[PDB]
Design a protein around this nucleic acid. Sequence first.
RNA 1: AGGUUUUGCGCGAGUGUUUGGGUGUAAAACCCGCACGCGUAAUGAAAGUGAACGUAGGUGAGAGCUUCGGCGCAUCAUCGA
RNA 2: AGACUAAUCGAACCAUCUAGUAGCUGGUUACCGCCGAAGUUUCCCUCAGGAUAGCAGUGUCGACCUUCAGUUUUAUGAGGU
RNA 3: UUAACUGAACGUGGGCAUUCGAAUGUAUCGACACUAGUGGGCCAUUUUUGGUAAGCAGAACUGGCGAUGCGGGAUGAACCG
RNA 4: AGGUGUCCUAAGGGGGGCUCAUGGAGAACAGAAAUCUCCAGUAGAACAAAAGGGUAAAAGUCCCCUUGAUUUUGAUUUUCAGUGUGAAUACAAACCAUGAAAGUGUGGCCUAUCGAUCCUUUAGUCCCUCGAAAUUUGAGGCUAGAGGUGCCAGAAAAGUUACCACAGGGAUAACUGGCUUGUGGCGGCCAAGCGUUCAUAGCGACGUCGCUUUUUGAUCCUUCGAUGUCGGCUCUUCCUAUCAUACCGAAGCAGAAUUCGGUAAGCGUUGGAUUGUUCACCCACUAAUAGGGAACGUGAGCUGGGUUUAGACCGUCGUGAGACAG
Lengths: 183, 149, 78, 53, 62, 104, 158
Amino acid sequence: GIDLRWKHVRSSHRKAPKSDNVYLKLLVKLYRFLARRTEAPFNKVVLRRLFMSRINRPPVSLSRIARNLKNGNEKKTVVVVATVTDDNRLLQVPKMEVAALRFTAKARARIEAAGGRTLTLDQLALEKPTGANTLLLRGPKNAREAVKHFGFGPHKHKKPYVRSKGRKFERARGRRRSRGFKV
Amino acid sequence: IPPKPRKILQLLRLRQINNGVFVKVTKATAEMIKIVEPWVAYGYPNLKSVRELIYKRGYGKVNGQRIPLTDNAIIEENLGKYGIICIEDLIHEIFTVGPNFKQAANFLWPFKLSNPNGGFRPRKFKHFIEGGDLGNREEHINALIRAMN
Amino acid sequence: AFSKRFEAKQQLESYISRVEEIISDPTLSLKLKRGQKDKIEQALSEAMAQLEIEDSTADELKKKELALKRLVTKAMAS
Amino acid sequence: AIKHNQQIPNNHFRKHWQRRVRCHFDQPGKKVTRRLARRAKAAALAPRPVDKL
Amino acid sequence: AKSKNSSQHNQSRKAHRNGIKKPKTQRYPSLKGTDPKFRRNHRHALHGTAKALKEFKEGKRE
Amino acid sequence: VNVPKTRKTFCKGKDCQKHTLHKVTQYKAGKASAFAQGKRRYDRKQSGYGGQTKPVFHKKAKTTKKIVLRLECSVCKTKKQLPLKRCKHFELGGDKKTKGAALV
Amino acid sequence: HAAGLRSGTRYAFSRGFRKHGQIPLSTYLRTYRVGDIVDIKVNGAVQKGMPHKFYHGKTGVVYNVTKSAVGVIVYKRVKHRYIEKRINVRIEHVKPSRSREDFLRRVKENAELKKKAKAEGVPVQLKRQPAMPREAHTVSIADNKPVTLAPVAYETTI
RNA sequence: AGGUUUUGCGCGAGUGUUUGGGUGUAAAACCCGCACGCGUAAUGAAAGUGAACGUAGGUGAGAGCUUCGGCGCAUCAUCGA
RNA sequence: AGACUAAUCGAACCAUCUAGUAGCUGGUUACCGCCGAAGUUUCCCUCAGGAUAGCAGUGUCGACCUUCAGUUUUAUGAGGU
RNA sequence: UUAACUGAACGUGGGCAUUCGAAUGUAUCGACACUAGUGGGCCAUUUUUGGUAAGCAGAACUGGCGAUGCGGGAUGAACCG
RNA sequence: AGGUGUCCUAAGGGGGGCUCAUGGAGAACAGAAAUCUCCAGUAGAACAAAAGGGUAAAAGUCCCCUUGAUUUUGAUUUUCAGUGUGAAUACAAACCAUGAAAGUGUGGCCUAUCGAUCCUUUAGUCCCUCGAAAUUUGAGGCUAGAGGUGCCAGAAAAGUUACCACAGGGAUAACUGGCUUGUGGCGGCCAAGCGUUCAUAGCGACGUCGCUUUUUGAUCCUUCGAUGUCGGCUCUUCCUAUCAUACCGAAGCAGAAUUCGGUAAGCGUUGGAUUGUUCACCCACUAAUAGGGAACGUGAGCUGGGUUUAGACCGUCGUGAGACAG
Ligand SMILES: [Mg+2]
Ligand SMILES: [Mg+2]
Ligand SMILES: [Mg+2]
Ligand SMILES: [Mg+2]
Ligand SMILES: [Mg+2]
Ligand SMILES: [Mg+2]
Ligand SMILES: [Mg+2]
Ligand SMILES: [Mg+2]
Ligand SMILES: [Mg+2]
Ligand SMILES: [Mg+2]
Ligand SMILES: [Mg+2]
Ligand SMILES: [Mg+2]
Ligand SMILES: [Mg+2]
Ligand SMILES: [Mg+2]
Ligand SMILES: [Mg+2]
Ligand SMILES: [Mg+2]
Ligand SMILES: [Mg+2]
Ligand SMILES: [Mg+2]
Ligand SMILES: [Mg+2]
Ligand SMILES: [Mg+2]
Ligand SMILES: [Mg+2]
Ligand SMILES: [Mg+2]
Ligand SMILES: [Mg+2]
Ligand SMILES: [Mg+2]
Ligand SMILES: [Mg+2]
Ligand SMILES: [Mg+2]
Ligand SMILES: [Mg+2]
Ligand SMILES: [Mg+2]
Ligand SMILES: [Mg+2]
Ligand SMILES: [Mg+2]
Ligand SMILES: [Mg+2]
Ligand SMILES: [Mg+2]
Ligand SMILES: [Mg+2]
Ligand SMILES: [Mg+2]
Ligand SMILES: [Mg+2]
Ligand SMILES: [Mg+2]
Ligand SMILES: [Mg+2]
Ligand SMILES: [Mg+2]
Ligand SMILES: [Mg+2]
Ligand SMILES: [Mg+2]
Ligand SMILES: [Mg+2]
Ligand SMILES: [Mg+2]
Ligand SMILES: [Mg+2]
Ligand SMILES: [Mg+2]
Ligand SMILES: [Mg+2]
Ligand SMILES: [Mg+2]
Ligand SMILES: [Mg+2]
Ligand SMILES: [Mg+2]
Ligand SMILES: [Mg+2]
Ligand SMILES: [Mg+2]
Ligand SMILES: [Mg+2]
Ligand SMILES: [Mg+2]
Ligand SMILES: [Mg+2]
Ligand SMILES: [Mg+2]
Ligand SMILES: [Mg+2]
Ligand SMILES: [Mg+2]
Ligand SMILES: [Mg+2]
Ligand SMILES: [Mg+2]
Ligand SMILES: [Mg+2]
Ligand SMILES: [Mg+2]
Ligand SMILES: [Mg+2]
Ligand SMILES: [Mg+2]
Ligand SMILES: [Mg+2]
Ligand SMILES: [Mg+2]
Ligand SMILES: [Mg+2]
Ligand SMILES: [Mg+2]
Ligand SMILES: [Mg+2]
Ligand SMILES: [Mg+2]
Ligand SMILES: [Mg+2]
Ligand SMILES: [Mg+2]
Ligand SMILES: [Mg+2]
Ligand SMILES: [Mg+2]
Ligand SMILES: [Mg+2]
Ligand SMILES: [Mg+2]
Ligand SMILES: [Mg+2]
Ligand SMILES: [Mg+2]
Ligand SMILES: [Mg+2]
Ligand SMILES: [Mg+2]
Ligand SMILES: [Mg+2]
Ligand SMILES: [Mg+2]
Ligand SMILES: [Mg+2]
Ligand SMILES: [Mg+2]
Ligand SMILES: [Mg+2]
Ligand SMILES: [Mg+2]
Ligand SMILES: [Zn+2]
């Protein structure tokens, strides 16, 4: 006997992508070599984000990029391991160069129209193997419809599952002191 | 085993039968040992016993792994910053309680000993005074180490 | 209701006459203090009133039966 | 019998619904029939347009 | 028929199975329950002190 | 239990908004109307064959009721309602008790 | 079997022997600020702003101050998790606590004692340590001759 | 048939050809568009009204980047508009 | 005599509605590997049954955060066996 | 808030590491999502209630059987290892 | 061991003067006990009620003025899922009460005294809708109370079956077996006294220690997809706490007849009247007519009188169907 609390405990994070895209398999091979034989911490972070599922790689927008292109960051390279989306509100698009997993049709057109350049994760490794002069970005993880229903309960101000919304669907008892109590 | 004495044995790194560790006696640790009386036997080592244990059963914790110590390069790589570079320094630090005793003792993996050669007493779960084997026996623990080592 | 109320009316009258014997004899009153004496007669005053009134029901009459008994029995016992 | 956080169900399946089910396996067969009827009608009205103003 | 009434035999072991979790303390506690009169004035106080420190670049230089 | 015929308390009138003398009167429920929506629906449910269609209460346990006082402002004729506790004998405007004049 | 608000408090809330009567008046002259460490001790005479019997003896942190009461934060242990509780207590029940005074005394002493050494230039060994085993010494038997003892025979007292 | 969370895939402020029409080597495959569904704006019983003081804010932590001074994603707490 | 009415009677026999409902008995089909329970809280015409919290598994993300603990020591409070 | 720039909370600037201020361990850090079985329990040391008593009925802290073989008690779910 | 479905315009709120229960010594009628005066008096009194806590220039008592038992909504504590109901604590914004003033007051000194959805009814603003457009009736909405569920988180509800049915339960009774031995039965220890005299020939009060499972209780572990449930007849064997027989020891044993004890289960222990009886009670014989076990031995061994299906009669009970260890 050995009197241990835990035994044969597995890891908690993905160690390989669950997707079977052939091109993505090549991209993992490249960065798996780079991370092993380079001291730059930028390579290790990029490798893990390639494994993540779609809900853990939310899209980023052109507006969110322009937000972080201020206060002395107008000359750096934006790297986004996700999709990049055009924003209809932004009327004037600044000049930037972006390395992203994929672009929408309109986002690619508007970036190069202003005088920018659209890169690729493989071309990024060819130009900046150590990731110098780069900034990483993420999308809003919690900006999803399904997250609003998480942890429903009294005094929590969450969203309920209703087949429709109106005065006939819930409200009533338990939502106003005029009928019993409130939550 | 009751829940409180079990937790103390976990903090002393004694999770298996016939294990052994070095501890320096203070008021903070003397009370911990007195709680787990009917589970352990302890005493005062001499120069030979500490010397034999390190040479024959000496293993070191390196990156969370049990690496047998057979070359001086292993000891220096992990205890060099405290001034210990050889296996004679490790023995000196343990035997004469030194300023860096805590790091030296925690480096050693808990010792694993075999059953004693001559056997125990007729009933080995009384106190040493009554005629058993568990408890404090002062210098008489050297004889027990010879058999179990 | 006519029978149930009428039954409780007699029992309440019986105990009021019953307790008058204890307070009247000199033997029991000799060792019993005034402070206990005047509290019994104070409780007896409003007991007389509700017999005259007609709105009293079985619940009200029965409640004061045990209330009067509980008060007097504490003095005699101790 | 609700057991967890669910949406309250309303499935109108308590009559004998199985007696009235209308599968559509004749979607392509019917289309061929209409095209045969249109060109037959157009042949009868040789120089005239098929429709009306 | 009759059955056991109540028990507490295995509750302590169940609770300690994956720890008794103490909520984490943190630098800025909430101001829920504090009396409103001090709460109203504290709002005006912080509004001014931000403006004054903002003017530190073209102004008071305290 | 007796309460005074008059008392002065807060009045929520549009122009009073202060303490003012009030008259005290007991509250009495009105007659049930014959054209309310609840009554009109109930009448239709009972027509034709089928019998009794809604429950009839039988197991009563309470012996008393809560007393509600209806007040009236002496200026703006505004009214208020104040509930009381449960009591058996209630009357308002009775004579006050006397202290120290015990006699049988 | 009943569960009232004050059930089982026959001896907890009672005043002691020869301690009934007037409340010492220095209680109302104390002052409190948020973040102070106070401990609760219920006084039987005052019947307003009296906390539940669970908090009689616990220690908490002030979080609100009002005209005649303070708000205290204490941690309650429901089965398998802790919960934060906020209670309102009249000042007749609270009292400043000496739990933290040893720490506050030691930090002031450490700062000044370290300052003088840095000017002088000697290590201090300031942090505390548990009791250590005794050291060697000598005991003389001059005019302290030992006396011999022995067990005593059985004897009947009564 | 209708819900819900998780995995893979396409397009992305949009998305869905197939009720239907054109066509065919004919129950396959390929092509076309007007409407419509869900999403892009909430809140009240209702008449109704309808989202920028600030580089889309202030403070404490934050991976990574950096001219070494600093700039600070996601998310957590807190005070405001 | 609850007797008899085709070996059937305290309500005949034949087909259909009908695969009538069951909080109750019985059964429920190849192999290997890793983790591993509960008979307890609150409510119910509830006590052979359900919902709710707990104990359990799997999928992960945030940092590798130096944070943590069924423990001892030192200082200081509460209790009525 | 005070007779009062006297206080109160939140702040700008500055000073204090040569040693971030008890022991031991860290073979297991924090947060979230979805869901299975269970809700008849029984035995023993110490404390203990009703009963003449029971292999009887009812509780508190902890360890066990149920869900578990192996070596001793000849045999024997719970005892010793 | 006890308590609650109430009671109160003050028994609620503010202020002020005074000190209680009881005891000692005194005064016309006057006494154990009426009213008056002085001294002592830590609560031994009083505070609506059950019990516990709390209170002395008061929280008790008398006197003076009053209605914070009011208006608008939020946060917190106890039971707890940190849901509801009940009750409770601390502030904020208004309007008042009391006092010279600081201050105190959001019902009763603290711990119990109570109630959803739907429907009905009253108060409030002068507000929203009746969908082709106006004006008055009527109806419907929004905010706060009341009418009630005591099985009190809240269905609308009388019996019988001995003519009976189905799904299940040894989670639950009626019989054996098992643990226990209170009651039942049987046996010891101490020695006040009885026995003419003399505690112990033969007995034994007041107390106290055990054994047995042929009495009856207590428990509900094994059997409800079944272990055939009273008694007698018949037949075998075992136990000893010995009725007779063999051989002996004691006496208040002269003989005869009896009484107490030991080794001993080898051998015997009956025929009839009444009752279904087990149990019992009389007649007669005899060396003697002892007590028990074996699934309360023994139904594919018998018998079927009793109990315990369906037919029928009486008495008491029930309006009735029907009930009764009559
Ligand atoms: Mg092994
Ligand atoms: Mg309503
Ligand atoms: Mg050998
Ligand atoms: Mg041995
Ligand atoms: Mg149970
Ligand atoms: Mg267990
Ligand atoms: Mg009306
Ligand atoms: Mg209505
Ligand atoms: Mg009609
Ligand atoms: Mg009808
Ligand atoms: Mg009709
Ligand atoms: Mg209790
Ligand atoms: Mg106390
Ligand atoms: Mg589906
Ligand atoms: Mg569209
Ligand atoms: Mg609208
Ligand atoms: Mg960093
Ligand atoms: Mg018949
Ligand atoms: Mg036939
Ligand atoms: Mg026939
Ligand atoms: Mg028929
Ligand atoms: Mg049929
Ligand atoms: Mg079927
Ligand atoms: Mg069937
Ligand atoms: Mg396995
Ligand atoms: Mg395992
Ligand atoms: Mg039951
Ligand atoms: Mg079962
Ligand atoms: Mg888990
Ligand atoms: Mg005591
Ligand atoms: Mg006690
Ligand atoms: Mg249950
Ligand atoms: Mg469940
Ligand atoms: Mg059971
Ligand atoms: Mg079950
Ligand atoms: Mg057993
Ligand atoms: Mg038990
Ligand atoms: Mg049992
Ligand atoms: Mg085992
Ligand atoms: Mg074995
Ligand atoms: Mg044995
Ligand atoms: Mg009782
Ligand atoms: Mg008053
Ligand atoms: Mg007063
Ligand atoms: Mg006064
Ligand atoms: Mg007292
Ligand atoms: Mg409870
Ligand atoms: Mg709550
Ligand atoms: Mg509550
Ligand atoms: Mg006030
Ligand atoms: Mg009072
Ligand atoms: Mg109060
Ligand atoms: Mg109501
Ligand atoms: Mg209703
Ligand atoms: Mg109109
Ligand atoms: Mg119309
Ligand atoms: Mg009603
Ligand atoms: Mg209930
Ligand atoms: Mg229903
Ligand atoms: Mg059983
Ligand atoms: Mg016996
Ligand atoms: Mg004599
Ligand atoms: Mg004798
Ligand atoms: Mg006797
Ligand atoms: Mg028996
Ligand atoms: Mg049985
Ligand atoms: Mg059976
Ligand atoms: Mg069988
Ligand atoms: Mg048989
Ligand atoms: Mg016979
Ligand atoms: Mg014999
Ligand atoms: Mg004999
Ligand atoms: Mg024989
Ligand atoms: Mg015969
Ligand atoms: Mg027997
Ligand atoms: Mg038999
Ligand atoms: Mg037979
Ligand atoms: Mg028989
Ligand atoms: Mg047989
Ligand atoms: Mg017969
Ligand atoms: Mg019959
Ligand atoms: Mg028949
Ligand atoms: Mg009759
Ligand atoms: Mg009969
Ligand atoms: Zn008015």
